[model samples]
Target: SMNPPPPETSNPNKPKRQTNQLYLLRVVLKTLWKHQFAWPFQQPVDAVKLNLPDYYKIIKTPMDMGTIKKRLENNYYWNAQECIQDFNTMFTNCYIYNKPGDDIVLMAEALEKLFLQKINELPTEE
Candidate 1:
């Protein structure tokens, strides 16, 4: 008979990944600002209004303030690529599941491409 295999072990010294929607939103806002997208308001409430409308126009989705607020409060985070995919999905789903059309489809594709390009260019933390 063969001996049992060794048990798997985890490395404790490795840094635990941390992600929060709040943090991700912060990162997106900063990136947009760095790219010279100006926000005319100062507060989070106002900030969302300033940005989400453009996103809504691009995706052809009606604004759901409740859902957006919930997202902001939800504490979830992920790797850079994951976060970018989430952004793409969020906007795409808004139109695809609701009002799919040429205007929305083309705009969504353009926005997704530009957003992913910019996000990918951001430097990752060590």
Candidate 2:
């Protein structure tokens, strides 16, 4: 026998392998809201893969409180109510696209606060 046998014979009649992927995202509104309020929250599920085993873990890396605070403070000029409303609508649609059963209201509230906080933290040419 040869150390490395010649390539195995191909099955010409066999069908070619094809992969079809289904993406899914689940949003728990309540969870997202906590971050904005400085409450704790777990990481969200990846819509690109519906498998529960592939769920994301919370970002446990320690972050400077000043960063979060600065972000929130920077959003000082934003109309809080409007920002909240817009985020609600946007995230709701995103969730719906991935999984209609996923929560919308909570996701919207949470994402809004998160975004606002993030924007504020960004350095600007003051």
Candidate 3:
């Protein structure tokens, strides 16, 4: 007789997210002075111009950073800076900040490190 599958594994398509997911993907981004994720630093543009659906689709399903990177590459014309910026934008725009300077820079650095760690742990696709 076989044991039952873990609950999360039952629904591979769904994401297990914390309440802070939006925070990580939004508020923190706006604080970075990024008004828009696509061309964030490009002079106060309309938020609607950012193509949010396509942007969020990449991060909605958790994957290793490399997979995320590759997906971005496929969807957004191989622009690494844009991918990183977009991901960072998502985080910056949705974070909850209580203080003026909330160590966002350090948080970004740490997140990058975490992404790298995730990438390293996953098997590479040769």
Candidate 4:
């Protein structure tokens, strides 16, 4: 019989890792909002003013507090991925490159890494 593999290691960084991801996501969203790319309204026309892509117009639709909470809390992984994709697309296609004081790129990159880490942590479908 094949020998069993060594027991899994206990991750001491688990709590901090969770907090870091949350913080990164918050930073990404706040940066988007600051640039008028996101809002808590039914129709975020402000994004149009900022010339965001058409997809943002749909994703930024106004949502009620309860609905937003439900979607975020219950579907955390899905929502996280959605946010990451949206931000990545916006930065790659719409954002002006090498603008001074533009930390959005960094924020977007950090968000992408965080979301990807979370996705990788999910159990695989065998």
> Which is better, 1 or 3, measured by lDDT?
1
- lDDT of model 4 at position 93: 34
lDDT of 2 by residue, 1-126 (tens): 112221112334533321110000012223344455433222223333434331223211222223223323333213334323433434543444445545544554556566555545433333
Best by lDDT: 1
Off by over 4 Å in 2: 1-71, 102-126
**Runs in model 3 with CA error above 4 Å?**
1-74, 77-102
Per-residue accuracy of model 4 over 18-113 as CA lDDT, tens digit each: 323433244434443344323332122244454544433344333222232232333343334443443354445323432434565555455445
Best of the two (2, 4) by TM-score:
4
Against the true structure, candidate 4 reaches a TM-score of: 0.30
Badly placed stretches (over 4 Å) of model 1 are: 1-24, 27-74, 98-101
The models' CA-based lDDT, in order, is 0.42, 0.34, 0.35, 0.37
Worst 10 residues of 1 by lDDT: 36-45
Residue 2 local lDDT, model 1: 22
| Descending-lDDT candidate ranking | 1, 4, 3, 2
TM values, all candidates: 0.39, 0.25, 0.25, 0.30
Candidate 4 segments exceeding 4 Å error: 1-45, 48-101
Q: For each candidate, C-alpha RMSD in Å? A: 15.3, 19.6, 16.7, 16.6
